[PDB]
Every structure is written in structure tokens, then in C-alpha cells.
Amino acid sequence: NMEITNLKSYKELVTLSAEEKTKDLKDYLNDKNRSESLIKKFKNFYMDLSRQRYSEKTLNKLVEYAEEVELKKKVEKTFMGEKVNMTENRSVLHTALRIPIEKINTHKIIIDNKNVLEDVHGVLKKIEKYSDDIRNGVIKTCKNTKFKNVICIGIGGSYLGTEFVYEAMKYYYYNMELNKNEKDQVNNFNNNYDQDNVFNVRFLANVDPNDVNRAIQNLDQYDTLVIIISKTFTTAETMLNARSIKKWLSLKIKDDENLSKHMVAVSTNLKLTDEFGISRDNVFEFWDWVGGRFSVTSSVGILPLSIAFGYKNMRNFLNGCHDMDEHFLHADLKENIPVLLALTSFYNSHFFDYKNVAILPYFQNLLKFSAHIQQLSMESNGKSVDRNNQPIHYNTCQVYFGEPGTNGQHSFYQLIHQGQVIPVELIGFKHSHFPIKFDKEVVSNHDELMTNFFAQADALAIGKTYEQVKEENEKNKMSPELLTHKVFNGNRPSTLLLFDELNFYTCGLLLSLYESRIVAEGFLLNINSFDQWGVELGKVLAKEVRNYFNDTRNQKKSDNTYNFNESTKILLNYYLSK
Amino acid sequence: MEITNLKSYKELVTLSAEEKTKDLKDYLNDKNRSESLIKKFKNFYMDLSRQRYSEKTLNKLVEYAEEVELKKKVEKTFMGEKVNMTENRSVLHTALRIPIEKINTHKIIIDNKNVLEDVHGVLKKIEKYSDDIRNGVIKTCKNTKFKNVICIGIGGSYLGTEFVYEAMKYYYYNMELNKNEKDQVNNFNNNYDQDNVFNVRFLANVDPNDVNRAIQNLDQYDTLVIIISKTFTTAETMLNARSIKKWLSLKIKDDENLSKHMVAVSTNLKLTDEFGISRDNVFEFWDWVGGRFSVTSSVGILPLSIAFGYKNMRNFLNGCHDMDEHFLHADLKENIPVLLALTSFYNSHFFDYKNVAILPYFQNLLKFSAHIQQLSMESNGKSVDRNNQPIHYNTCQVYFGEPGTNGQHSFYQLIHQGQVIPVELIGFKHSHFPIKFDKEVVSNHDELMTNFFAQADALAIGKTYEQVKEENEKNKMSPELLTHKVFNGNRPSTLLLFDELNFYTCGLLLSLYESRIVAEGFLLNINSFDQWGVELGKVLAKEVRNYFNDTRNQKKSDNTYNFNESTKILLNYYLSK
Ligand SMILES: O=P(O)(O)OC[C@H]1O[C@@](O)(CO)[C@@H](O)[C@@H]1O
Numbered sequence A: 001n002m003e004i005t006n007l008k009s010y011k012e013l014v015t016l017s018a019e020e021k022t023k024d025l026k027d028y029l030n031d032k033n034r035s036e037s038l039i040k041k042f043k044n045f046y047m048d049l050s051r052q053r054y055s056e057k058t059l060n061k062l063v064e065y066a067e068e069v070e071l072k073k074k075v076e077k078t079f080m081g082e083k084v085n086m087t088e089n090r091s092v093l094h095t096a097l098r099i100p101i102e103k104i105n106t107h108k109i110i111i112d113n114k115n116v117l118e119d120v121h122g123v124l125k126k127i128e129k130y131s132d133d134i135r136n137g138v139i140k141t142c143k144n145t146k147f148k149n150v151i152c153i154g155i156g157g158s159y160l161g162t163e164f165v166y167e168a169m170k171y172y173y174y175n176m177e178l179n180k181n182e183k184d185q186v187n188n189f190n191n192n193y194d195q196d197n198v199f200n201v202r203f204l205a206n207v208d209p210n211d212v213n214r215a216i217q218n219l220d221q222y223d224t225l226v227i228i229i230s231k232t233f234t235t236a237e238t239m240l241n242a243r244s245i246k247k248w249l250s251l252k253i254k255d256d257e258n259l260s261k262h263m264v265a266v267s268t269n270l271k272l273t274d275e276f277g278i279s280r281d282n283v284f285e286f287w288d289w290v291g292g293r294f295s296v297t298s299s300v301g302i303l304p305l306s307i308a309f310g311y312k313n314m315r316n317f318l319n320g321c322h323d324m325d326e327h328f329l330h331a332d333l334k335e336n337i338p339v340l341l342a343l344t345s346f347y348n349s350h351f352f353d354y355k356n357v358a359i360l361p362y363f364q365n366l367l368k369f370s371a372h373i374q375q376l377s378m379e380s381n382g383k384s385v386d387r388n389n390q391p392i393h394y395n396t397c398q399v400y401f402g403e404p405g406t407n408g409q410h411s412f413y414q415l416i417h418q419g420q421v422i423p424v425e426l427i428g429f430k431h432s433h434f435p436i437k438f439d440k441e442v443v444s445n446h447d448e449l450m451t452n453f454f455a456q457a458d459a460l461a462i463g464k465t466y467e468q469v470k471e472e473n474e475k476n477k478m479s480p481e482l483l484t485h486k487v488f489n490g491n492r493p494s495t496l497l498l499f500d501e502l503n504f505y506t507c508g509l510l511l512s513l514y515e516s517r518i519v520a521e522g523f524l525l526n527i528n529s530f531d532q533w534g535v536e537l538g539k540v541l542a543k544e545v546r547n548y549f550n551d552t553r554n555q556k557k558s559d560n561t562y563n564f565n566e567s568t569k570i571l572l573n574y575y576l577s578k
Numbered sequence B: 001m002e003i004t005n006l007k008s009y010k011e012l013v014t015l016s017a018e019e020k021t022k023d024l025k026d027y028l029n030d031k032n033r034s035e036s037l038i039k040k041f042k043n044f045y046m047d048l049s050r051q052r053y054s055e056k057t058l059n060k061l062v063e064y065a066e067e068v069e070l071k072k073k074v075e076k077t078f079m080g081e082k083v084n085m086t087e088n089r090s091v092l093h094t095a096l097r098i099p100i101e102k103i104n105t106h107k108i109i110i111d112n113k114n115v116l117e118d119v120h121g122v123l124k125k126i127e128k129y130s131d132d133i134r135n136g137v138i139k140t141c142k143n144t145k146f147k148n149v150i151c152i153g154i155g156g157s158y159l160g161t162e163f164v165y166e167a168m169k170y171y172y173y174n175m176e177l178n179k180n181e182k183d184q185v186n187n188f189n190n191n192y193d194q195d196n197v198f199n200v201r202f203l204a205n206v207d208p209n210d211v212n213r214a215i216q217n218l219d220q221y222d223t224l225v226i227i228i229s230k231t232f233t234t235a236e237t238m239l240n241a242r243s244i245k246k247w248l249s250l251k252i253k254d255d256e257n258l259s260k261h262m263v264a265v266s267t268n269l270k271l272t273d274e275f276g277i278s279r280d281n282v283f284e285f286w287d288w289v290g291g292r293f294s295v296t297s298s299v300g301i302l303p304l305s306i307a308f309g310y311k312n313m314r315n316f317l318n319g320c321h322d323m324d325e326h327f328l329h330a331d332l333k334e335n336i337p338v339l340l341a342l343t344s345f346y347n348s349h350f351f352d353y354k355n356v357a358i359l360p361y362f363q364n365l366l367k368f369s370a371h372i373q374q375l376s377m378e379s380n381g382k383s384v385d386r387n388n389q390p391i392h393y394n395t396c397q398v399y400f401g402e403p404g405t406n407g408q409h410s411f412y413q414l415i416h417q418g419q420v421i422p423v424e425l426i427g428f429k430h431s432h433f434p435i436k437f438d439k440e441v442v443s444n445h446d447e448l449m450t451n452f453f454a455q456a457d458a459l460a461i462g463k464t465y466e467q468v469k470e471e472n473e474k475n476k477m478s479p480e481l482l483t484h485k486v487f488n489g490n491r492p493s494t495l496l497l498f499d500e501l502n503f504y505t506c507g508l509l510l511s512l513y514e515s516r517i518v519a520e521g522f523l524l525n526i527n528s529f530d531q532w533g534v535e536l537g538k539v540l541a542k543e544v545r546n547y548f549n550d551t552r553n554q555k556k557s558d559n560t561y562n563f564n565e566s567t568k569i570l571l572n573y574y575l576s577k
């Protein structure tokens, strides 16, 4: 009945943050001991939390807040399969999806007198066989050839995770695997990208027919495999696109048995998949306890990604997710990397009113990561009601955005440096997927990229005072009244994630890091990270407009009665005019 | 004299406090308020009715615009006055789209020269060059027609271009090359592998992974390389320019033949020549063209005319110009970009709504928000006013967004129930690829559009606890859980409804936003035209570059390093085996 804002540890953070606002990051960053403590190590990476507006004592108080909210107990309940999604009375078991086969019995999770891991591995073995058959040409097209194209039909959670992993991993797969490039082997300009096992993967998400146009461009139905991805199998957009692509396939494929060879589905709904006409062997199910934004580790991602890259690569991705899941569950709070990332976020949002998060990966191949983190974070934590079902008014999820570095530096870093304070989350690697270096160059292209990774973090934290600007004006000679424009106040926070390499295992580590961070933060915020009641009103209202459009376009009436406001009426009139 | 102390500003603080007590549901039942807040211009409507203000408060926002002398300031900008006060420079992106018939009437004199003569000189050069590439008059080193175009540029040197490219490509492929008619659905037989369909790539990042993406499946012999940089010094663009030249050099061995595959766009004539580019292969622009306002210059007009034809690009310029004319001449109360800027300013200042979601209900607009992000945030993300005084009031909002309906399954959960985020919805009456099947209740475009109207209403009106309790008599959810289904409403939105996305309309949309940002900068009393905030990171990265060179090559230098305790630890890990 009392809110998290009333806990002793919450009230202490209010006091400590007030003192922290008076302190500079410049002073903290000159303490070697604080740096050595705020730089956390893992086998594959470093998480540098030193450019955060806290002393080690304040961080210890954030850890004390996590204990008071019983974060460990809550995370454990989630992993155990307890019904922690309280508004839907459902389990949250995306972590089960990546438990390896050797642990099927030791790490068993019982839901309705059945070990869920048996269902998990049943589908994974099914994906492994199917993807191997497509890649070996055992499962062929209606014209008895090897499939070349894959159209994934799905929106939100049914494609965002998948496309992030796809885009992140495609060049590692093409370069290190198909082209056999060794790590740090430079200027691989002779690499071949038009070869066997290079699949043309397309994501059809929007109901806008322009997205169908993009999906089908230069594509032959005869070479195309269609994967319909939908948890519910009712989503207005996915289903209109699923029907549209079937009709598109039907333009060339005339026999139903041959058409069946070109269509596969991923859902929790066996009835609706059959009603669509997808064969039982062509349905790769997942379960209700898998939230859409936590679904990439299920058939949602594992099916298209294993076709594209091979199952073995996807098994290593699952292994990475699992190792990070194990760290999340077992590590003490004070040394739990996702927990400390969640606490930092919670601290900035609550105690400094920093209501934005910039996801800035210094890796072009991570161009689809932010779009995934946007759903995972905003749809989970963009809540108004607490776990005690009480409407709350304190800060919930921040607004997430970002572009890969260095791109963002020439777009919106101007604002991150001199406008509103926006905590940044920087992600970097020690190695490239496509190393470049020329003898005349001062640095390798990857190093050039990385100079920015380190520099931006420092520029944000330290700034440049009026006095330093005045000093550098002795040579520049700008009209002295204009010098205020060149001041950088500093004290702008950043986290640095530095991994060694972006391989399938590390990509899984990165995914679980964020999934774990969001789960931890939801419990810190005392909200349900697992529901999405906020998307319902817009669906209801759009069905009314759909019926109105059908009545109006067909110059007729129906059983539906419409009560559109004065503005909607004017714009609908213009919209439906010749 | 800061904005917060002006009479009209204090009055808006008072009026906004009263507005917080009023519901959009009540305002949306007033036909007269709706007729007034729905503005019409040519083939488009701007619906401002789902904004938390009465006609009387909007009139006070118009009174604030008069007190800040918005009209005078916009006019000074168009006239070529040095309004970029920190760099003592003109702001003349509007000059780029003045048509040839207005070269003299609309003349702008800078250093005893009509700038429009330089504008049209370059446009005539682009027209000839793009026609020659498209007709195969200007050929490759193997005397064939170019097929690929690699655009090397970052920030303002590609964002506008890629927005327009992605927005227009299918209109060009479908209505022009495939001759599709508005009355025709299901154009599944359209051909996309044909003569004037160029393979356009954007190489922006210095990350070699971006070079990998740019060159994938590309033959040097078929590839034209456009190096785009205002300065021609940018660390990333120049390293990529040198990297692609070496890549071209792998197959192209003679300098004269290599010259045929490289063109540049810059304000720097020395640096483009010292790079090795021929003067007839340099399509210049000017210092008074800000990067984030540069698409209407050779920056966009050169690659876009190669891809789509100059005639199409001339129509795009005409659209920018018509909206520029509306921006300059329309009365404040009826000025679309000014009213969009005032609304934004009102939400940010008086309601503390520090975000803007750019939500186009058109997949072809997938690169629009990335452009609007720079245009808005790099212009207005400022800390110091035009009187050179550090300020602490709100400046530019955080801009983000994804095309509709995609965003609805990503972050609208938060827009509906989390923090209030004013939305800017953009829609069209027609598709670039209309689809309709006889068994379907609606055309795919109509299905998309049901959401456009519905989301705006859902946000404005909401659903009370009582309405949730009423529909639970049948639903039968455990009553304590009903609070989760409450939608508070009063969440603002602007609706932009255009008839069609053609080259002309795309220009109207671009200038609408450019005009909005210019108006807002003056409302905020900041310089929208400088970017001093990007300098510190460049300086610090050069230090790290030198350090990397000295350490990787195990050799000392004249450079001295003072890295903080954290940078030292991570650099050691970064450089270790
Ligand atoms: O049932 P689906 O088609 O998988 O789509 C659900 C997507 O849309 C949602 O907004 C739910 O409606 C996301 O949670 C989810 O991933």
C-alpha cells in the first residue's frame, strides 16, 4: 500500500543524490581507486560505470535499496517459473529457452506437471533438423531447388530481436565463416557474398503495402520461403500481410501441396495456424510464458536465424544468453552486472530526473540493436500502475533512442553535450568484423572509430570551463562575449561496455545483459515488466475506423454506430474524398 | 532581456496552468475550435486540435511570437542577414530552391554577387551531369553505363539525402518506370531490375563494417563515388574517401580512369583539388548552407538527380520553395510552420514535455525521423541565448520515432501509459504500392490509416476507471487489476495529412520541418545555425588517435598524454592481445 518511494533506502538516496549534484566527475575520474572499483570485469568484457554521478558509498546505498526491494528473491521467483506477471497470472520463462540439453533434467522447470525444457528442446531439435534440411537442400522449393529467400512476417517482438541479431551477425558469418577470414586479417576486399548459404532475408513488419513492396522487390515466389511470426496469430498487421503474401505466392504456385512447402509459422496458437493452412510439420511453436520482447531465444528468432546462419551458431548464441542468465541469477547484487546497470538507470531517472537513455553502439553492425532495446525497455517499463495495483506518479521507463557511433556524433550529440543531459550507454569492441588498415594511415579504421568511443565519454564527463575557453581564445581571438557558446558544463553521465569481439556467444551475452537489466529495473520500479495493457485502446479505436472505412468506401451503412469527434470527422472527410 | 521575463511569456505560464485542468475530450466536441485548429495548405491539412490549448491560448502564443519579433527575424534570415551571430554568417538554404524565373526578382547579394547565379550555375551543372550518367554519355573506365553510386558523408552530408532517397525511390520505380496509375492495385508484375534503377549506398560511419556494407557485391568498374563533406576535413568522411579510392584502385589502375569514378560535393575548392578531384567533378555548395539544411544543395540534388532524374528534383525544389514562401508571407495565426513551432515550444516550456515522437504512417518515410533528429537536435540543442547569456530554460526536445504502425508494437505502450510524449503523425491519402483483395474488409493502405486516426483519438480521449469498470461486467477480470487498463488521456498530437507523397509534396514536408526549426530557434532565442557542442569530442579523439599510433607502433612522439584514471584502464584493455 506504501510505494517504493517510502523505503528507508530510497529516502537515503534522495539525500545522497543532493550531495552528488554538488560534485564533479572530473574529481572522481582522478581517483585511480574509484576507477579500479567502478570498472567491472567479466570474461569477455568490461563495464565501466565510473562516469556516473556517484561515489562508491552511494553505489553501495543503491545496492542496499535493491536488498530492501528483495530484488534477489524476485529475480529467483521469475527463474523458478512463478507467476510474476501478476496482471495476466502468467510465468516469465524466456530464460528457460536457452537452458542447454545437458541441463534438461538438473534445471527442470515444472508447469502443469510437465518439464517445460522438454518442449523447449523438442522445438529446438525440430529447428535444427529443418534449418539443416533447407541449408543442405533436403527440403526444397516447389520447383525442386534450394530456397534463396526468406520473408519474415511479424511486427514488434516478432521481428525486432531477430533483425537486431541478424544485422549484428550477418557479416561475422559471411566474413569469418563463409570467407574464412581470421581475426585481425585486414582488407578482405576479395570476400564473396553471392554464394551458397547466403540467404536473402527480408522483414515484413508494417501493414503499409509499401512494406510488402520492399519485401517482394526482385523476389521470385519459387525461391522464397515465408515465415509467419505472431505470438497470438491475430495481430491485424501480421495477418493482413500473411494473407497478402500467400496470395502473392499463389500468383505463381498453383497447387496447395507446393504452396505448403513455401509457408511456415511461429506462434503459441495451434488452432489459428491450422485455420491459416500451415502444416503441423511447418509450425515451430513457442509458449505463453515467453513475452514477445523476450522472444528472440524462442523459435521467433532461432528459426529464421538458424536458416540464415546455421543451427550450431544459434546454439552458441543460446549458450551466451544462458551464461549471462546464470550470472544474473547467482551473482551477489554488488557484483551483478545487469543489476548494477539497472540501479544506475534507476538512480539517474529517479534522483537526477534524467528521463532519457541513448543506446550508442560504436559498431555499424549493431544498427538494429537500439530499435530492439526500445521495445524491450519501453513496452516493459513504460507503466503507470505498481505491482500492488496502485496508480503511481514516480518515473518509470525513460525514452530510449540512439544511432550507432560515430554517426550519432554528427546528428544529435550537440544536444547530449550542450542541451538536456542524456545518460549514454556506449558499446564497443576490440575487433572489427571487417578489419581495414593501409600502410600510409596513422591508425586502422577500427581504431579511428574507437578514438571516439573513449573521447566522447570523457568529453561528456569532464567538459571545458569558461576559463579553459578564455585561455584558448588568446590564439583564436573570438569576440569575447561569444565565448559562453563554447562552454561544456560536463557532469554528463556514461556507461562504457567494451567487449573483445562480437561473435554469436558475445551477441547472446549482450542480449541477456539487456533482458536481465530490464527485469531487474521493473522490480526496482515495482511495476509489471511483463504485460502491455497500454496498446489495447488504439486497437479498439482502429477497428471502429476500419468498419467506418468499409461502410463509407462501399457507399453503405451497417450494425455499427459511429461517434467521431469534430476533428476526426473533418479529416476522415478529407481522407475519403476523391 | 530573457524570454522568461517577457509579458506574453508570463501570461502563457498562467494560461497553461488553467489548461492543465481542461480535457481534450471537451475541446474535441467544439466544431468551431476544430475548424480553426485544422489548417489547410495546397494538398495538405495540419490538425492541431489535440493540443492542450483553447483558441484564446493559441492567440496568446501568437502574441508571444509578435513580442519576440518572429516575423522580422525570419525575414532577416531570408534576406541574407548574418543571423548566425556566433559564426557571423548568413543562413541561406532557402536560396537553394528559388526557381530560375526568380533569379533576379528574388536576388540575394553577398560580397557584390547575386548568390542565385552560383545556385543555378551548380544546378545546371548537376542537370547536365545527371542526364549524361542516365543517358550513358558519361561512362565508366570500361566505357559502360554506371550502375552503382556510393555516397561518402556523415550527418548533414547524408541524412537529408537518404530520407528523400528512401521516401521517393518506390514512387519513381512504380509511377514513373513501371507506369502505375492511381486507379490500379496489386502491381506485383513491376520490374525493379532495369536501366535507370541505380544501386545507391550510404557510407557514413568510419567503422570499417560500414565500408563492408557499402562495397558488398559491388564492382569498382560499375561504381561512381560521391564524396560529400561541407569542410572536406571530417575525420570519418576523409578516412572513408581514402579507403574507397584504394578500393577503386584495386581494379582501376590509370589516374585518368580513376578520375571518371570519383566526384565531390564541398564548400572547399582547395581540399577537393588536393584530394585529386577534377573541377568539373566538384559540385560546390556554400558556407551559408548548414549541413542539416543542405539536402536542397548539390549534397542531395547531385545523388538524387542521378538516381531519379533532374526534372523530378526540380519539382522537389519547387515544393520546398512554395512552403518557404508560405513560411515567409503567411500571417502568424495562419502560418503552418510557425504554429507547429509554437505548439512544440508551448508543450516543452509550459507542460515540460521534453520529447517529440516523429511517427510517419508511411514505411517509405523510414529515414525521415533520423533526418529530423539532426535538423532539430543539432540546431536547437543549445545552452546559451542570442544575447550570449547561459540559459536554463528548456531548449530542443529529444526526438525519436519509427514509422506507423511499427511503433505501436514497440513503444506506444509508454506514449499511452508512461511519460507523456507529444506525437507528430504524418499520413497520406494514397499509397506508392496500393494493395486490395476482394475478400478483404479494407485495402492495406486503409488498414494502415485506421491506426493514424485512432491513435490520435486514443491519446487525446483515453478511457476512465468507470469506463473500464463498466466493460468488466462481461470481462470479469479480478477487480483490483482494473487500474492497469486506465488511459488518462490528454496526451497531445498533431496530424499532418497529405494527399500523396510525390517529389513536390516531399519538398513541402522538408521545408515544413526546416521552417519549423528556424521559427522555434527564434522562439527559444538561441542560435539554430551553429554547432560548437561537437568540438570537444573531435579534439579528444585526435589525442586518442595519436596515442593509438604511438602504442601500436611501439614508438614515442612529440605528443604528451593526460588521460584520466578510467581511460587509462580501458585503453590498456583495448590495446592488449
Ligand atoms: O502477437 P504478435 O503478432 O506476436 O505481436 C505482438 C506484438 O505487438 C505487441 O504490442 C503486443 O500487441 C508486442 O508486445 C508484441 O510483440
Ligand SMILES: O=P(O)(O)OC[C@H]1O[C@@](O)(CO)[C@@H](O)[C@@H]1O
Residues within 6 Å of the ligand: A409, A410, A411, B154, B155, B156, B157, B228, B229, B230, B231, B232, B233, B234, B237, B291, B292, B378, B531, B534
Ligand atoms: O559535411 P561535413 O563537413 O563532413 O560535416 C558533417 C556533419 O558533422 C557535423 O556534426 C558538423 O560537425 C554536422 O553539422 C555536419 O553535417
